[PDB]
PDB file of C-alpha atoms in Angstrom:
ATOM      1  CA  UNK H   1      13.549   4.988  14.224  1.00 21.18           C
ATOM      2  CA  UNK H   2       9.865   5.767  14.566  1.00 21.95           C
ATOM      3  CA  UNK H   3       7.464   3.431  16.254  1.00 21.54           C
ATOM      4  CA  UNK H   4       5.286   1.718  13.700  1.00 20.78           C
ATOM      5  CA  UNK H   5       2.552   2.212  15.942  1.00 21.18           C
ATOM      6  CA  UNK H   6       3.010   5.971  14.679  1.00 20.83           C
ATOM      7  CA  UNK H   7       0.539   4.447  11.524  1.00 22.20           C
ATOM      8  CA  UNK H   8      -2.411   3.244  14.206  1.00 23.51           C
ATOM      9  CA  UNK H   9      -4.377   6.672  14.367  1.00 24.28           C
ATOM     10  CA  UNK H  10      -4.645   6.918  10.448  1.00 27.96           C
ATOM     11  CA  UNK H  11      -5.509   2.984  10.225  1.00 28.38           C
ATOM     12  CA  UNK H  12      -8.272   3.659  12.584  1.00 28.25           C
ATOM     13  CA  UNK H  13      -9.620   7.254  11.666  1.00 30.41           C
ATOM     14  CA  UNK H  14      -9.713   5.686   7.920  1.00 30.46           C
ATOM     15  CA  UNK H  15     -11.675   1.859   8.920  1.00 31.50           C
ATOM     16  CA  UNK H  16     -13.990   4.915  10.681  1.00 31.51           C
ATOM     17  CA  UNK H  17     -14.491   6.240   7.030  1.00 32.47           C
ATOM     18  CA  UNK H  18     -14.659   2.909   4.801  1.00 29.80           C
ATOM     19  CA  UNK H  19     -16.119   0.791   7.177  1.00 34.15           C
ATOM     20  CA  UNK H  20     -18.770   3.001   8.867  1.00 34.77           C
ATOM     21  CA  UNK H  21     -19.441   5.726   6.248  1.00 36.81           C
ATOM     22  CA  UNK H  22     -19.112   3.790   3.300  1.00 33.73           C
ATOM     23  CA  UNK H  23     -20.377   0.395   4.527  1.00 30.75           C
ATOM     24  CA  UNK H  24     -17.444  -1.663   3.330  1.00 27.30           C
ATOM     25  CA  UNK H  25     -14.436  -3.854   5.017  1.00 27.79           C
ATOM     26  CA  UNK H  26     -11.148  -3.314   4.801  1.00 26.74           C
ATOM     27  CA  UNK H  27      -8.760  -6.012   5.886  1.00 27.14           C
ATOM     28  CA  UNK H  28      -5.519  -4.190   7.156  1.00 27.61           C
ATOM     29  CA  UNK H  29      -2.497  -5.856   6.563  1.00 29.85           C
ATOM     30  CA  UNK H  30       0.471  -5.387   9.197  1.00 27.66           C
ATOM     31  CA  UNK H  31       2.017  -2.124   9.162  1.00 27.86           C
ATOM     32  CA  UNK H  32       5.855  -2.944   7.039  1.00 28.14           C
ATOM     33  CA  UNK H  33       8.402  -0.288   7.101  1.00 24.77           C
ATOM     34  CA  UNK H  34       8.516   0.329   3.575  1.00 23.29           C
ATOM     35  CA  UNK H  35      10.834  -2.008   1.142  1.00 23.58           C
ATOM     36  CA  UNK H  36       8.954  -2.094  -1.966  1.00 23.56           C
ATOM     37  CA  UNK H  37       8.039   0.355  -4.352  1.00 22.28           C
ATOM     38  CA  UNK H  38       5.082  -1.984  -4.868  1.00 23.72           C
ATOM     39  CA  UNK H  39       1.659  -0.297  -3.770  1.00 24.10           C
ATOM     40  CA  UNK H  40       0.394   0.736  -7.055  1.00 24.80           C
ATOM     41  CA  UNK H  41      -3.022   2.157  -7.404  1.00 25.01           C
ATOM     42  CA  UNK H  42      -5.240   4.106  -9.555  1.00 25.18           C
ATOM     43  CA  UNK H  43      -6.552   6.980  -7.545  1.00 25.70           C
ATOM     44  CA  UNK H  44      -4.256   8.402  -3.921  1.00 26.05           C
ATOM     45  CA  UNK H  45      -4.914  11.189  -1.474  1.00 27.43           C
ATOM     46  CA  UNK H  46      -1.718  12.883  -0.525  1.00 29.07           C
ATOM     47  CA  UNK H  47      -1.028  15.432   2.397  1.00 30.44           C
ATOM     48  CA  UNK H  48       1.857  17.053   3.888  1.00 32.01           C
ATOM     49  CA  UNK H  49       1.835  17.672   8.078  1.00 33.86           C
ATOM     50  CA  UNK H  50       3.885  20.359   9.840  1.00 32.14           C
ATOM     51  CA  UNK H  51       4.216  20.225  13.401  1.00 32.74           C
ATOM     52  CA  UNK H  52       6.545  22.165  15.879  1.00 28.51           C
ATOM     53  CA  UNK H  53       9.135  19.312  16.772  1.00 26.75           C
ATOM     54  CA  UNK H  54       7.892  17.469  13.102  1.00 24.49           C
ATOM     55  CA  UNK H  55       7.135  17.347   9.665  1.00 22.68           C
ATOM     56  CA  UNK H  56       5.835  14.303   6.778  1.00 20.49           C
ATOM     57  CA  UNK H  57       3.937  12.945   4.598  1.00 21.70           C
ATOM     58  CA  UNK H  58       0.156  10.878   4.338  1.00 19.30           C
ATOM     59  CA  UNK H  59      -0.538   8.949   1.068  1.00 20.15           C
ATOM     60  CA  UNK H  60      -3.968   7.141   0.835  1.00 16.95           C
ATOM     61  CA  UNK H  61      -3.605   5.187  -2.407  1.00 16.96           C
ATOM     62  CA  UNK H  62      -6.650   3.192  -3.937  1.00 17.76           C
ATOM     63  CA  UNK H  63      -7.481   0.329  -6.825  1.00 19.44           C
ATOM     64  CA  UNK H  64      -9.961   1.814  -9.112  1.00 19.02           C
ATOM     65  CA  UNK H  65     -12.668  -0.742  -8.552  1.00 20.13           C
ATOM     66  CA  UNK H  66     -12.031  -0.208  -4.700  1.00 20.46           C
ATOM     67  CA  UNK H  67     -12.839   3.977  -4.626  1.00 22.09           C
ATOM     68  CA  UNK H  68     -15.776   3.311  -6.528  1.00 17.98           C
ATOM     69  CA  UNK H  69     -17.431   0.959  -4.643  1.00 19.53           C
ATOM     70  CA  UNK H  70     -16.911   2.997  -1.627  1.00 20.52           C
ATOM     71  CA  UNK H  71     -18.130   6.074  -4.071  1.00 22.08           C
ATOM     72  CA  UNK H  72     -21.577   4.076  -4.505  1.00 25.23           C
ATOM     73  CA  UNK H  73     -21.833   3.256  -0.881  1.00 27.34           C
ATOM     74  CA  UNK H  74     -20.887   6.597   0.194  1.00 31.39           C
ATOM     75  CA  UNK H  75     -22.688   8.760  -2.211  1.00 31.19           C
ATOM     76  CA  UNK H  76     -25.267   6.696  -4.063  1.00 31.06           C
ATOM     77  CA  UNK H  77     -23.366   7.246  -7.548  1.00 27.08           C
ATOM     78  CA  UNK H  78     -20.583   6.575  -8.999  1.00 27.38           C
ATOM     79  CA  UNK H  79     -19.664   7.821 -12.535  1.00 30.97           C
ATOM     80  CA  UNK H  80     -17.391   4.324 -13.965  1.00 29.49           C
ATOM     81  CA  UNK H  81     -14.338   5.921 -14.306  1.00 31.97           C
ATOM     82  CA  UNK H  82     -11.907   8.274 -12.177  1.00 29.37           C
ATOM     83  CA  UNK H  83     -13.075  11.694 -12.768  1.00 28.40           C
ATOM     84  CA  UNK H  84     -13.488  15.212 -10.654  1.00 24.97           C
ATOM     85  CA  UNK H  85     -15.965  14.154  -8.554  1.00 25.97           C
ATOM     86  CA  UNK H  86     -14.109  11.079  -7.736  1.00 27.48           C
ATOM     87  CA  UNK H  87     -11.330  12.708  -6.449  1.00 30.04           C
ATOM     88  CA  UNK H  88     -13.364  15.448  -4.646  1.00 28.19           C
ATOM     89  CA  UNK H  89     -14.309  12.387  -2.785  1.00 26.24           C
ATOM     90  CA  UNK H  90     -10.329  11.390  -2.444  1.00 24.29           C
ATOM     91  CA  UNK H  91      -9.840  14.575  -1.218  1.00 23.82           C
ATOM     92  CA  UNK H  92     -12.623  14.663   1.783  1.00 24.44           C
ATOM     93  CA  UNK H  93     -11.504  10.866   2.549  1.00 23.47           C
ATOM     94  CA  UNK H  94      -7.746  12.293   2.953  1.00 21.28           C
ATOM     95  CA  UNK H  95      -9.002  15.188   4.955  1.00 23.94           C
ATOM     96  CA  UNK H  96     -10.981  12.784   7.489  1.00 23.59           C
ATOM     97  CA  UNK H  97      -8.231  10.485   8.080  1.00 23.11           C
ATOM     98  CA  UNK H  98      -5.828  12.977   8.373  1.00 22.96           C
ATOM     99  CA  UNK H  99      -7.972  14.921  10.702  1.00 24.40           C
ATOM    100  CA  UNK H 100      -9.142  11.777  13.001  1.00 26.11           C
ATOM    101  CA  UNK H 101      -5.233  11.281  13.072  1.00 25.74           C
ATOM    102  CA  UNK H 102      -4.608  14.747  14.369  1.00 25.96           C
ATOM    103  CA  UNK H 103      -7.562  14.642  17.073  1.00 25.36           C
ATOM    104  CA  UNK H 104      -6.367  11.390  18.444  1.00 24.52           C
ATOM    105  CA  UNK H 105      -2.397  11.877  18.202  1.00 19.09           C
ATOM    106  CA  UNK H 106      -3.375  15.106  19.939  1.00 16.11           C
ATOM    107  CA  UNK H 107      -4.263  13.792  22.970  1.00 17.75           C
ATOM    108  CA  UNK H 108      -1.149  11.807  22.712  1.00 18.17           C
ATOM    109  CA  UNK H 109       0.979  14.917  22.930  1.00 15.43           C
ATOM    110  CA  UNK H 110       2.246  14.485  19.394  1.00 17.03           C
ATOM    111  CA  UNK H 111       0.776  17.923  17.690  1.00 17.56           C
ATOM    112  CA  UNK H 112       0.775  19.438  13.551  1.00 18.95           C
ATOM    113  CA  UNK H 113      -0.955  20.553  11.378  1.00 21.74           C
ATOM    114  CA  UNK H 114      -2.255  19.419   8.307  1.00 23.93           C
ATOM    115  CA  UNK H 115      -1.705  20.835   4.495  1.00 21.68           C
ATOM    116  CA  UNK H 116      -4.296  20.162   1.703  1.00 23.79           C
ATOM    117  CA  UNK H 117      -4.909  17.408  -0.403  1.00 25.08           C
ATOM    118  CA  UNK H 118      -3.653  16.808  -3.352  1.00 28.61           C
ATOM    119  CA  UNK H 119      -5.351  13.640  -5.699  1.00 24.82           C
ATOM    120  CA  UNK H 120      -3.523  11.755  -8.236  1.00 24.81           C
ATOM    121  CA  UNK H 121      -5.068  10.144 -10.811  1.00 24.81           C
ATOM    122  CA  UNK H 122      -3.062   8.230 -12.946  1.00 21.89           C
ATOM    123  CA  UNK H 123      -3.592   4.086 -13.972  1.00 19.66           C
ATOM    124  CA  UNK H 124      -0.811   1.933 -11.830  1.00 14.55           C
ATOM    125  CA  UNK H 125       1.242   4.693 -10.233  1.00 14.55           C
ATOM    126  CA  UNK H 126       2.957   4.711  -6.899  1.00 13.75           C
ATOM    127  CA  UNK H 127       4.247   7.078  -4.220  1.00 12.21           C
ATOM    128  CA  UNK H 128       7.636   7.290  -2.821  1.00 14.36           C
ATOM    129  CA  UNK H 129       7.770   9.706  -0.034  1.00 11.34           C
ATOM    130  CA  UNK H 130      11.232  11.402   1.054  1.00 13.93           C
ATOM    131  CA  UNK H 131      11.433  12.658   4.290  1.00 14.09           C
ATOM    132  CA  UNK H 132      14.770  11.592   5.792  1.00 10.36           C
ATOM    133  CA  UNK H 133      12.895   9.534   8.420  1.00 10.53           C
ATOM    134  CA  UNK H 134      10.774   5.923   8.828  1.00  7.86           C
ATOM    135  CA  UNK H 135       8.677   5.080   6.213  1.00 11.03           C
ATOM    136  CA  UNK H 136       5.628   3.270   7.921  1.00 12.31           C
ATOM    137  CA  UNK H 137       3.356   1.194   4.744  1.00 13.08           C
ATOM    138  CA  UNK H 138       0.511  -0.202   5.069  1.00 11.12           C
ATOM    139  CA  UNK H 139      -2.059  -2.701   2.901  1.00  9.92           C
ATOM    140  CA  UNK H 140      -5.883  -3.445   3.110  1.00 12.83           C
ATOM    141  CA  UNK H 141      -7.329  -5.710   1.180  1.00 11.78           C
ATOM    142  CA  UNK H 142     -11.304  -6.317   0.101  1.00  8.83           C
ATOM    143  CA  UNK H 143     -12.685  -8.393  -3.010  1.00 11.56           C
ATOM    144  CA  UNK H 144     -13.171  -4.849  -4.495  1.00 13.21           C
ATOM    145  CA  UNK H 145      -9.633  -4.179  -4.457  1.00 16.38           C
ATOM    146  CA  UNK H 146      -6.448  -2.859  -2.337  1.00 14.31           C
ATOM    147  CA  UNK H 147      -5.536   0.309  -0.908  1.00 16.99           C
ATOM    148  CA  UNK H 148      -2.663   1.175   1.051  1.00 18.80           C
ATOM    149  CA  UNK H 149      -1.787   3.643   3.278  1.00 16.83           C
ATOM    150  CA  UNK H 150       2.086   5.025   3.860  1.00 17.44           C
ATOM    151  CA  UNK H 151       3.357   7.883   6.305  1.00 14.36           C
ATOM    152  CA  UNK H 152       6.546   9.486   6.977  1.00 16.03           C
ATOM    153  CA  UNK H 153       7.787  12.175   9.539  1.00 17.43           C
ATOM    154  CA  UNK H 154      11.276  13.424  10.429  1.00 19.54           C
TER     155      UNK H 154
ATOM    156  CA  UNK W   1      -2.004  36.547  -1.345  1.00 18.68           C
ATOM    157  CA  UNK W   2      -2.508  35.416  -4.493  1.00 18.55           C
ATOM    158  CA  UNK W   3      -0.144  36.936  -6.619  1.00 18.36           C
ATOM    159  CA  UNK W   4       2.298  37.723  -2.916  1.00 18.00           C
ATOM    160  CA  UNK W   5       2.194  34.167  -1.768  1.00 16.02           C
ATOM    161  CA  UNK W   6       2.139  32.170  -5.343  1.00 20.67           C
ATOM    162  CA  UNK W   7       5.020  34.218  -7.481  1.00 21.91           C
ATOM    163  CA  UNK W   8       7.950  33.414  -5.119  1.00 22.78           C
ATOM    164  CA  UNK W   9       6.927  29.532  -5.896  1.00 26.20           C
ATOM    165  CA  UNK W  10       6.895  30.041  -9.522  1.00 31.81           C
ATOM    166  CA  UNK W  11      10.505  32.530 -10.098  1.00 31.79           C
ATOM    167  CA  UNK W  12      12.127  29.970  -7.601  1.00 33.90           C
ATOM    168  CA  UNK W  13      11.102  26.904  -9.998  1.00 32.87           C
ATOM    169  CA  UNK W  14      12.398  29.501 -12.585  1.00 33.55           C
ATOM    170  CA  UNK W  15      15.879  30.168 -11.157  1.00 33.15           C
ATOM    171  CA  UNK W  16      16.135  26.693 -10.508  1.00 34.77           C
ATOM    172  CA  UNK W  17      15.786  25.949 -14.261  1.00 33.40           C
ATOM    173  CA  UNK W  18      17.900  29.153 -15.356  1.00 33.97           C
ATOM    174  CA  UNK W  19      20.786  26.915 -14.158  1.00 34.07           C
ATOM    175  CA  UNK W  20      20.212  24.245 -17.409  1.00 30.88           C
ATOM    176  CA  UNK W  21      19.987  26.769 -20.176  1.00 31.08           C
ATOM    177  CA  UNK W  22      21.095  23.734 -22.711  1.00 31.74           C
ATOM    178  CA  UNK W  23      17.050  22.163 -22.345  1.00 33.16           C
ATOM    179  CA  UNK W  24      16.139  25.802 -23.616  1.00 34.14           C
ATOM    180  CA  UNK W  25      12.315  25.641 -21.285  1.00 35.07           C
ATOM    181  CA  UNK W  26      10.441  28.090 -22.424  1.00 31.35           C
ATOM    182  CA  UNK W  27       7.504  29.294 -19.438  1.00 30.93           C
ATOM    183  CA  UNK W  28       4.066  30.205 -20.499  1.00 33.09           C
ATOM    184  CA  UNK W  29       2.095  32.503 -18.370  1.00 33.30           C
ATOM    185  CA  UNK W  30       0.917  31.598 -14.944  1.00 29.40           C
ATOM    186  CA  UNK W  31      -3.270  31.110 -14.994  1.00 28.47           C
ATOM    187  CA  UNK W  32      -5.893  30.141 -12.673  1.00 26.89           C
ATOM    188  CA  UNK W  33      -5.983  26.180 -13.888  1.00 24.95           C
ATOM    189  CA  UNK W  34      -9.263  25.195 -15.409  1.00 23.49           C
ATOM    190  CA  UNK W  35      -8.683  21.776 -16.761  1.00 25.15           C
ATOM    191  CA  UNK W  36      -7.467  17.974 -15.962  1.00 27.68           C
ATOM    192  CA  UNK W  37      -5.413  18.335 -19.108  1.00 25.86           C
ATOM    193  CA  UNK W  38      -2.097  18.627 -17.533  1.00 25.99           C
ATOM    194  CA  UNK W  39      -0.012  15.220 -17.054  1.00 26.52           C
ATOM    195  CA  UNK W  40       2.891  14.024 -16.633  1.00 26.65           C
ATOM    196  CA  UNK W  41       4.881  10.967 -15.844  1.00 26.66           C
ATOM    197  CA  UNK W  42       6.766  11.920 -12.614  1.00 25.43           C
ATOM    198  CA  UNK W  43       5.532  14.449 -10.064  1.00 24.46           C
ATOM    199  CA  UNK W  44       6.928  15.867  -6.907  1.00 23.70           C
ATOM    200  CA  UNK W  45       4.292  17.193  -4.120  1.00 21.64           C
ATOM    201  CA  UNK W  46       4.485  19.199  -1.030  1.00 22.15           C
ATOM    202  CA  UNK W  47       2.039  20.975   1.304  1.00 25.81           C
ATOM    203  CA  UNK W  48       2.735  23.880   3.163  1.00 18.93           C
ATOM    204  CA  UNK W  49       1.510  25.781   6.081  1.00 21.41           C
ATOM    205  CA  UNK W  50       1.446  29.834   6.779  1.00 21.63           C
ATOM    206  CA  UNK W  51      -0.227  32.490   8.337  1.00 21.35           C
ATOM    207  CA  UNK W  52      -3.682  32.023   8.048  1.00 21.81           C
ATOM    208  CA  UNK W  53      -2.970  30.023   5.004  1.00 20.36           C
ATOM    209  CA  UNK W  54      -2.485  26.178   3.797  1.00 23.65           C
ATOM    210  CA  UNK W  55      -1.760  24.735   0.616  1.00 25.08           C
ATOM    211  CA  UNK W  56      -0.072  23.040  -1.731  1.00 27.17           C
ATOM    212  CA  UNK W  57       2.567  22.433  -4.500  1.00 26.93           C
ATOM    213  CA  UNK W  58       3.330  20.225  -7.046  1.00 27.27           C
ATOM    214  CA  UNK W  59       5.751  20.006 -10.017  1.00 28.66           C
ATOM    215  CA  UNK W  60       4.938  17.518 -12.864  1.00 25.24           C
ATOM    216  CA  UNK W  61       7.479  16.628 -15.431  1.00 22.18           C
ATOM    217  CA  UNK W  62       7.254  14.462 -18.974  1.00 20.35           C
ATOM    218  CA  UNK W  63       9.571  11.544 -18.937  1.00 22.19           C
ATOM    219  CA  UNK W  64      11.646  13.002 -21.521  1.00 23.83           C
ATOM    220  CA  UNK W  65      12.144  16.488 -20.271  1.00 28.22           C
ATOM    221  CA  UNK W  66      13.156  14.687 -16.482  1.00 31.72           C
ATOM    222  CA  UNK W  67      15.645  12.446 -17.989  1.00 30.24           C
ATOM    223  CA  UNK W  68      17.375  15.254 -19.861  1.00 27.11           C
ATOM    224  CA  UNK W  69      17.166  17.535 -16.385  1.00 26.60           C
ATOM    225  CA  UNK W  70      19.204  14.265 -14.985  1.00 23.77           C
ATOM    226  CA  UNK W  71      21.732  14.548 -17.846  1.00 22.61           C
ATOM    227  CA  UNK W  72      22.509  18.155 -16.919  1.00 22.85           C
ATOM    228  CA  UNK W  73      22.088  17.464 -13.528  1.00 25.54           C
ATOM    229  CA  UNK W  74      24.212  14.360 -12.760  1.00 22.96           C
ATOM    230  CA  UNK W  75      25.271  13.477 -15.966  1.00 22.72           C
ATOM    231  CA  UNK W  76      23.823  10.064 -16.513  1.00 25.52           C
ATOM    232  CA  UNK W  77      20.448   9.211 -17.174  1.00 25.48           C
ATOM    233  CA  UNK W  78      18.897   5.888 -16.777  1.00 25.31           C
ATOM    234  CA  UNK W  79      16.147   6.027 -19.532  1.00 26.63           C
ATOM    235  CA  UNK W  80      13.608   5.023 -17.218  1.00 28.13           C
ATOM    236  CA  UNK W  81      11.851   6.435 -13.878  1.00 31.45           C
ATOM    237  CA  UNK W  82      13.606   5.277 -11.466  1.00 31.49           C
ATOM    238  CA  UNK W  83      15.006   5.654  -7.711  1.00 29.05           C
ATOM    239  CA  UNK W  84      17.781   7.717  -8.765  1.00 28.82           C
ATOM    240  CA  UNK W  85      15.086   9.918 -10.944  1.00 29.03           C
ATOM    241  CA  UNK W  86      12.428   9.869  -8.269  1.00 27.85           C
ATOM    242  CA  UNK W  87      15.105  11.204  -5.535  1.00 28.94           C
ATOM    243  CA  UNK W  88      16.101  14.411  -8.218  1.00 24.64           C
ATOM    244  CA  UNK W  89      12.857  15.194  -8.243  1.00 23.81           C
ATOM    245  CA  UNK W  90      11.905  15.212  -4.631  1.00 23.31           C
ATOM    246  CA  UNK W  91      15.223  17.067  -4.301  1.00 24.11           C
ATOM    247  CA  UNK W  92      14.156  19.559  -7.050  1.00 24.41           C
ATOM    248  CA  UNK W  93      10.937  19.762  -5.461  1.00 25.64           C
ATOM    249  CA  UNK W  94      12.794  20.766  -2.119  1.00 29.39           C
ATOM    250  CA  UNK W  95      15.200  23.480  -3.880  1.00 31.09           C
ATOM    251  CA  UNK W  96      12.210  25.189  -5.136  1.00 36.01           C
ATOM    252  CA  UNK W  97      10.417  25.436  -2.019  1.00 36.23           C
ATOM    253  CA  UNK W  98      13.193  25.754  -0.074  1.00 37.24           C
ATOM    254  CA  UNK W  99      13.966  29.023  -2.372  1.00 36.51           C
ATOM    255  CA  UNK W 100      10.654  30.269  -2.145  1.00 38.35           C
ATOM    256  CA  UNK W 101      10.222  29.965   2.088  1.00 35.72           C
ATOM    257  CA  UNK W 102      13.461  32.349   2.031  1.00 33.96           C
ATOM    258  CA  UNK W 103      11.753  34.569  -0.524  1.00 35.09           C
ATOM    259  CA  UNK W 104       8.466  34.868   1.399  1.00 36.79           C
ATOM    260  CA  UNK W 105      10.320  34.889   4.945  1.00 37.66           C
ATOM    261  CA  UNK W 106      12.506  38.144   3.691  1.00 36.21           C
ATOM    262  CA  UNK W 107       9.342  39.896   2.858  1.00 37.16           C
ATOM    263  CA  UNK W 108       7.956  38.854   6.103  1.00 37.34           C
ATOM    264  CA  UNK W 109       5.707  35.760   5.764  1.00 39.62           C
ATOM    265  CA  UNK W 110       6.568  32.619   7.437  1.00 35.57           C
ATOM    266  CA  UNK W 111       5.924  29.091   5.611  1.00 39.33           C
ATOM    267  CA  UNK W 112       6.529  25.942   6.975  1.00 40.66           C
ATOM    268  CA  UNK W 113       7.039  22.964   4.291  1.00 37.57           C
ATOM    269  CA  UNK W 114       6.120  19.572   4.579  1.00 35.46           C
ATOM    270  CA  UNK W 115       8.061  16.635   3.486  1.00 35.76           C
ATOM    271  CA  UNK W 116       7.859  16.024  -0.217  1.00 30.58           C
ATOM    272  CA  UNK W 117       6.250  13.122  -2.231  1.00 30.11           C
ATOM    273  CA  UNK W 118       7.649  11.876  -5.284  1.00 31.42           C
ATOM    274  CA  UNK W 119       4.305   9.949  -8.007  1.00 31.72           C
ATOM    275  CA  UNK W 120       5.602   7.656 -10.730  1.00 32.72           C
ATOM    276  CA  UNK W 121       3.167   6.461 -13.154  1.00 34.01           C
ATOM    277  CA  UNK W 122       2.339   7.090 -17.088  1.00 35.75           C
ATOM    278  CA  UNK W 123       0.219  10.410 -17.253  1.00 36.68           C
ATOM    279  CA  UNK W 124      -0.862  10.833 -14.204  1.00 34.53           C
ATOM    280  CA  UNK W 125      -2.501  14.064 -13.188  1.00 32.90           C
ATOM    281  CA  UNK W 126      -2.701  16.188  -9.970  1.00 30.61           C
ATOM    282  CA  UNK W 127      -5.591  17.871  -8.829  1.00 26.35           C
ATOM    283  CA  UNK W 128      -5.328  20.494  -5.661  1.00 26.33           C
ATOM    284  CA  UNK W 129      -8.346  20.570  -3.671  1.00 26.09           C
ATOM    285  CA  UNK W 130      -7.532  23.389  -1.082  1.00 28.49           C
ATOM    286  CA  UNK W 131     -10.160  25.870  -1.041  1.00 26.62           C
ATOM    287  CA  UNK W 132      -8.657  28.509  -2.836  1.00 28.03           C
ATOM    288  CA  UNK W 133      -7.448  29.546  -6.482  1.00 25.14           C
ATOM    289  CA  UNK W 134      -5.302  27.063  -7.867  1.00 28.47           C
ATOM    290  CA  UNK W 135      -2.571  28.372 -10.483  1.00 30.01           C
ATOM    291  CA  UNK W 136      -0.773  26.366 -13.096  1.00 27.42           C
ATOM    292  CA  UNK W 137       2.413  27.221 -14.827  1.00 24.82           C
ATOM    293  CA  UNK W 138       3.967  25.706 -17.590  1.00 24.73           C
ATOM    294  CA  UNK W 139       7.587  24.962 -19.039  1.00 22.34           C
ATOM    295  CA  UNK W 140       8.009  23.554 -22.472  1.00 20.23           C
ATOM    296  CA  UNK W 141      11.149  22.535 -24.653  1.00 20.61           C
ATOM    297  CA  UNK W 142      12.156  20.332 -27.151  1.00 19.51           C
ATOM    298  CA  UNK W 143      12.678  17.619 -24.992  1.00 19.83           C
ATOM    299  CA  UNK W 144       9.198  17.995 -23.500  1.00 19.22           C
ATOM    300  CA  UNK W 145       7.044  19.789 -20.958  1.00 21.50           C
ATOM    301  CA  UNK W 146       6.738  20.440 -16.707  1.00 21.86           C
ATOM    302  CA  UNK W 147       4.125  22.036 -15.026  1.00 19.73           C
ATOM    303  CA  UNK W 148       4.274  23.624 -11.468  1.00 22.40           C
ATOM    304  CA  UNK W 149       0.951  24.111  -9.599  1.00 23.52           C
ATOM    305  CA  UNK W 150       0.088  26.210  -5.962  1.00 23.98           C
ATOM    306  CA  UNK W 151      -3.007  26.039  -4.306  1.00 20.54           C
ATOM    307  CA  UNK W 152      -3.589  27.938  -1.284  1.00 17.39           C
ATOM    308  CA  UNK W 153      -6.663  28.147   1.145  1.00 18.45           C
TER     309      UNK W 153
END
């Protein structure tokens, strides 16, 4: 029965990426414990976490529109499409907000490790994690688009 | 590491096939991926931690060839992805890695496994961005194709 507040350190570490790095505001939604298989997107940043008393799952998911606008603001570029460098980019976002996370549930007490990205890239999909454990979704919205952040940990 | 820490991933995925010799999956050979070509329409994802290592797995199936793995499985299928679909496949995912953390821990190498991650769309792709060399397997049949991938860094 985690707290929901569990979701806080990867809402902030990734408004440090979008907003700051890539010059572009998210509005969060309020953190749901997952009842929908409803946050599609076009583009998501996935990454497991092992810890000693823990282990889940971080999915970054993001409209199309919405990862390349923060691809031109980020990089200067931005190629019209998903492609490789697109979800390099995925990739480092996932990596950031997953590390911020770590650094800041750290000094919390709460410690793991993360695995390596993984990027899908598929039109309209959606991610259903399965850890026996609380599913903690989130949504942001901008006129670019929506992206949505879920974890889970046993 | 590469062929030590990958090959347990790809004869448990193996073994766990073995078991449904009615879809007749024939494997290709295991090679360093160098393409976005391979998709599928439901994928199960895990990463993984070891010594001095990270990485990641993921096993992507055609809609077809899952549905059929359900009919063996459970005996039902629903004709569709669905809950019931996207739980076999986490599951499956699980088995395999599961399987593979036993291998590895006999021969003396201890991985810890994340929770898995189950993707529904229509062909979708997966691409691993550890730093390391990523290696793609496939398994084809007549009722259609799965591909297992590991990455580690």
């Amino acid at each position: 029965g985690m707290n929901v507040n569990f979701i806080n350190p990867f809402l902030q570490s990734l408004l440090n990426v979008i907003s700051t790095m890539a010059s572009l505001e998210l509005t969060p939604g309020k953190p749901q414990i997952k009842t929908d298989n409803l946050a599609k997107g076009d583009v998501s940043g996935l990454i497991g976490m092992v810890g000693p008393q823990t282990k889940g799952s971080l999915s970054i998911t993001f409209e199309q529109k919405l990862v390349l606008q923060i691809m031109q603001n980020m990089l200067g570029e931005n190629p019209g499409k998903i492609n490789e460098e697109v979800t390099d980019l995925v990739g480092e976002i996932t990596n950031m907000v997953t590390g911020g996370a770590k650094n800041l549930l750290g000094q919390k007490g709460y410690e793991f490790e993360m695995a390596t990205p993984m990027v899908v890239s598929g039109q309209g999909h959606t991610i259903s994690h399965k850890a026996n454990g609380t599913k903690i979704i989130m949504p942001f919205t901008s006129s670019y688009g929506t992206a949505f952040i879920e974890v889970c940990f046993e």
